[PDB]
């Protein structure tokens, strides 16, 4: 399972199980470039979020019901959606993943 | 140690 591999491989589930996580299969620069695209509000009302003009290749990792540390279990879902990231700093880079649409 | 930009990258980027 790609999700099981990448979550422990990326130090996300090496010390516990995370309920959900999203991976974007695009170049780093292409994702950083979203910080100057469609400005929209974040879920918390904050206004430093931006939506990508185009859909992107992503894989959603969701923990099944039979998942318990130390044996996490994820269901893998591949799709193409617009990503929403919060940006901050200089360079104005993405610091948080807000959502996919 | 790790910046928020670096953490976001390692957690969500699979280019």
Q: Which CATH number belongs to the domain containing residue A77 in this structure?
A: 3.10.130.10
At what resolution in Å was this solved? 2.2
Burial A26-37 (b: 16+ CB within 10 A, else e): beeeebbebbee
Q: How far is B13 from chain A (nearest CA, A)?
A: 5
Task: State the sign of the Cα–Cα–Cα–Cα dihedral A87, A89, A93, A94.
Answer: negative
CA distance B1 to chain A (A): 15
Secondary structure (3-state) at A13 = coil
Which residues does A9 contact at the CB level (< 8 Å), separation at least 6? none
SS3 state of residue A90: coil
Domains held by chain A: number: 1
Beta partners for residue A58, in sequence order: A24, A79
Experimental technique of record: X-ray
3-class secondary structure per residue, chain B: CCCHHHHHHHHHECC
With H, G, I as helix, E, B as strand and everything else as coil, classify residue A7.
Answer: helix
Which residues span the domain enclosing A79? 1-101
């Amino acid at each position: 399972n790609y999700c099981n591999q990448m979550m422990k491989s990326r130090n996300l589930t090496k010390d516990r199980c995370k309920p959900v996580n999203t991976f974007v299969h695009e170049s780093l620069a292409d994702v950083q470039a979203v910080c100057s695209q469609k400005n929209v509000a974040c879920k918390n009302g904050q206004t430093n979020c931006y939506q990508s003009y185009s859909t992107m290749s992503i894989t959603d990792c969701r923990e099944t019901g039979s998942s318990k540390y130390p044996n996490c279990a994820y269901k893998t879902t591949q799709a193409n959606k617009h990503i929403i990231v919060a940006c901050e700093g200089n360079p104005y880079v993405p610091v948080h993943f807000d959502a996919s649409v | 140690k790790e910046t928020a930009a670096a953490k976001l990258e390692r957690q969500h980027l699979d280019s």
